[PDB]
Amino acid sequence: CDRIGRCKDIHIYRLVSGNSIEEKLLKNGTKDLIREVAAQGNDYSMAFLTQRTI
């Protein structure tokens, strides 16, 4: 997306639903990588549940 808009003052707009977990995932999206341990029963991210609730 940045490559195609390589120059000429490109404008990027992002739509995110308010008061939803989408904002939490946007601000913090590294959880997918932090849990790169063996799949099929990771069972990690205990404290990160606060984002799903809010």
């Binding site: 990027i12 308010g18 977990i21 995932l25 946007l26 990690y44 991210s45 549940l49 799903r52």
Partner: protein, 124 residues
């Protein structure tokens, strides 16, 4: 047969001096604290720069995050999803990663009720 030569490289390796020496030799055929001395030796023939030049160098990028509330249908679907047996799954009851990913996907497609709830005509 050429009187001059020009080479383009993205970035060379720090260690493995063999490659650097071979490149310097093939530049011109007239040659037979560690990193500091290596850079000092490569002073006469070197021209490098970093991306710090992009500052005010016509590189103008703009990003605007626009917040948008949910519709009544969206609110209803969200309340329904969060208020379901999945609550226990969200509380890390079993297969935590799987149920979390499933709930995230559901809430993601819930950004438009027409996707999960396809409005259809009321035929008679």
């Amino acid at each position: 047969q050429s009187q001059q030569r020009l080479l383009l490289i993205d970035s060379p390796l720090h260690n493995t001096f063999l490659e650097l020496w071979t490149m310097v030799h093939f530049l011109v055929p007239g040659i037979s604290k560690v990193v500091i001395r290596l850079h000092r030796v490569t002073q006469p023939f070197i021209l490098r720069r970093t991306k710090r030049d992009v500052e005010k160098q016509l590189t103008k990028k703009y990003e605007h995050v626009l917040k948008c509330r949910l519709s009544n249908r969206q609110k209803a679907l969200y309340e329904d999803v969060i208020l379901q047996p999945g609550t226990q799954e969200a509380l890390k009851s079993g297969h935590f990663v799987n149920v979390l990913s499933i709930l995230v996907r559901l809430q993601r497609i819930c950004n438009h009720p027409g996707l999960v709830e396809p409005r259809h005509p009321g035929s008679s």
